[PDB]
Subunit: 21 residues, 12 copies
């Protein structure tokens, strides 16, 4: 599968997360 | 315009946000 | 099917609508 | 992550589900 | 139009459906 | 960026708008 | 609602169609 | 990559096509 | 939920997979 | 296939492009 | 919110940009 | 156009690819 990337900015911290499809 | 609803969920808290289009 | 929701904000007047898939 | 909401509707009944991203 | 295919799995019945665009 | 277009048809009145990405 | 524009192109001819949302 | 499938119904003929991502 | 289908190719080893939504 | 239209805008100028699916 | 990344390649300049959702 | 990025995994042989739009 494909794994995208995104900066998941919550209320306390951001972080690069994958997104698996 | 259309406004979708979503929750921006960080560590362990969420917040309603709109998404305007 | 899945039904999404959105506020359809027209000429100064909104209303929730469904979106079928 | 972002959480969307939709109705998952079957033959007769529906249910709210999250769609997390 | 394009017709996608999906398994609409409900509470007591899955079934292939078209999704038209 | 890419700019898409859509007719925003409100309370009996449409108008072309852009959508930036 | 929003109305996107698209062309439904077959063999070698196209036709404008709307896509309502 | 992922290869989806769709019935591409033009004006003269439909046909299962891939969609490569 | 809806289950779409795709061929998941990597090094010429495709295979049908689901995509749950 | 379906053909969408968008403006591909750079530093200063834009251009119409098709997005075919 | 989620921040995707893309290379916005224009006529005479590519550059990484965020896309916020 | 915009170029997104993803890891294309098949049999544990991932690698960065573009996705042109």
């Amino acid at each position: 599968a494909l794994v995208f990337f995104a900066e998941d900015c919550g209320s306390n911290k951001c972080a690069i997360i994958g997104l698996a499809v």
